[PDB]
Amino acid sequence: GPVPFSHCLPTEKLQRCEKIGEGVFGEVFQTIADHTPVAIKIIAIEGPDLVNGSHQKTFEEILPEIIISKELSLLSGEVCNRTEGFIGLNSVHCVQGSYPPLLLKAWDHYNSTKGSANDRPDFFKDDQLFIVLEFEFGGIDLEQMRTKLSSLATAKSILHQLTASLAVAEASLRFEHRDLHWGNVLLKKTSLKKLHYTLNGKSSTIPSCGLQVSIIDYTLSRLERDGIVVFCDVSMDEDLFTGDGDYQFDIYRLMKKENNNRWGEYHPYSNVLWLHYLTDKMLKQMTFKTKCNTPAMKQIKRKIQEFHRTMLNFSSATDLLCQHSLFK
Ligand SMILES: Nc1cccc(-c2cnn3ccc(Nc4cccc(Cl)c4)nc23)c1
Numbered sequence: 001g002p003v004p005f006s007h008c009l010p011t012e013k014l015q016r017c018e019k020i021g022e023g024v025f026g027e028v029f030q031t032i033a034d035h036t037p038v039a040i041k042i043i044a045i046e047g048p049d050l051v052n053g054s055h056q057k058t059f060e061e062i063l064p065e066i067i068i069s070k071e072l073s074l075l076s077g078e079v080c081n082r083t084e085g086f087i088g089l090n091s092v093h094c095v096q097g098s099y100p101p102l103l104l105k106a107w108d109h110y111n112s113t114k115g116s117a118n119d120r121p122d123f124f125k126d127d128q129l130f131i132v133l134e135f136e137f138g139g140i141d142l143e144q145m146r147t148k149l150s151s152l153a154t155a156k157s158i159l160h161q162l163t164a165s166l167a168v169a170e171a172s173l174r175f176e177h178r179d180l181h182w183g184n185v186l187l188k189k190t191s192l193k194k195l196h197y198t199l200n201g202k203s204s205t206i207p208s209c210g211l212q213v214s215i216i217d218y219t220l221s222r223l224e225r226d227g228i229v230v231f232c233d234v235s236m237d238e239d240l241f242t243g244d245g246d247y248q249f250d251i252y253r254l255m256k257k258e259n260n261n262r263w264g265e266y267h268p269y270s271n272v273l274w275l276h277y278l279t280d281k282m283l284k285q286m287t288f289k290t291k292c293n294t295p296a297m298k299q300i301k302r303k304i305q306e307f308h309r310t311m312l313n314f315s316s317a318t319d320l321l322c323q324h325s326l327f328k
Pocket residue numbers: 020021022023028039041069087135136137138139140141183184186216217218
C-alpha cells in the first residue's frame with residue numbers, strides 16, 4: 001500500500017523544500033536528502049477532482065514515465081552506450097495524504113514571485129494518492145537561464161551535449177523524448193573542461209563551456225527494449241496538437257505528421273524536431289554576456305544558423321551527431 005507523506009518528506013525535508021517548477025502534471029520542489037540536493041516531482045493520481053484543468057492520471061498511466069525514468073537513470077553507468085546527459089532517479093513512492101502545509105507554503109512563495117499556471121494544491125483529502133519521484137538535482141532549466149549564458153559558444157556546447165545524449169538513448173533504447181521544450185533542459189555548473197560519452201562502443205568528448213546539460217521530464221517519452229515499447233499514447237489527446245504562440249506547439253503537430261498518429265512506433269526524427277526548436281530558441285530568445293561583435297562569435301553564430309537551416313534533413317540525433325558539420 002501507499003506510505004504516509006511523512007515517510008518521503010519528514011519535517012526537516014519539508015522545511016527545506018522550495019518550489020522550482022510545475023506543469024499540468026503537478027509540482028517540482030528542490031530539497032535536501034542526507035545533505036544532498038534533490039528534486040521531487042509530485043503527481044496526484046487516481047482521484048476524482050480536476051487538477052490544473054485535467055482529470056488525474058491513474059497509476060497505469062504514470063507507469064511509462066516511471067519506467068523510462070528508471071531506464072534513462074542507468075545510462076550514466078553503462079559502457080557501450082553511456083552518457084551523464086539525462087538524470088538519476090533515486091526513488092519512487094506511492095504516498096497517501098492531504099498536501100503538506102509546508103509544500104503549500106513553498107507553492108505560495110513561487111506563485112508570489114514567479115506566478116503559477118496551476119490550481120493551489122490544497123483541496124486534496126487525506127486519502128489522496130500521489131506518486132513522488134526523487135531525482136538527482138540537475139541544476140537550472142534553460143528557459144530561466146535564457147539571459148544567463150556567456151556566449152553562443154556556450155549555446156554550441158549545449159546543442160552538442162543534447163544531440164549526443166539523445167543519440168546515445170536512440171542507440172541504447174530507441175528513445176524519443178517527445179516534449180523537449182526549454183523547461184525540460186537543465187544546466188549545472190561544472191569544473192570539468194570536457195564531457196564524455198560513448199556511442200556504440202566509441203567514446204568521444206565535448207568541451208563543456210562550464211556546464212553539464214541534463215535532459216529531464218519523461219512524461220511524453222517513448223523507448224523500447226527487446227521489442228517491448230513503453231510510451232505515452234496521445235493519439236486521442238486533442239488539445240496537445242491545438243496549441244499556439246510558440247514554435248513548441250508546432251512540434252507536437254509535426255511529430256503527429258511524422259508518425260501518422262502512431263505513438264507506439266519509433267520515429268527518432270522527433271528528437272531532431274525538438275533539437276530544431278531548441279536551436280531556434282537559442283538564436284532568438286537568449287541574451288548572452290558576450291554580444292555578436294567578434295570574428296569567433298560571428299562564425300559560431302553562422303555555424304548555429306547553418307545547423308538550424310540544415311538539421312531537419314537529418315533522420316535522428318544519431319545522424320546529426322555522426323554527420324552534421326557543426327560537431328566535427
Ligand atoms: N525527470 C525529472 C522530472 C522533473 C524534475 C527533474 C529535475 C531534476 N533536477 N531538477 C532541477 C530543476 C528542475 N526544474 C524544473 C523546472 C521546471 C519544470 C520542471 Cl518539470 C523542472 N527539475 C529537475 C527531473
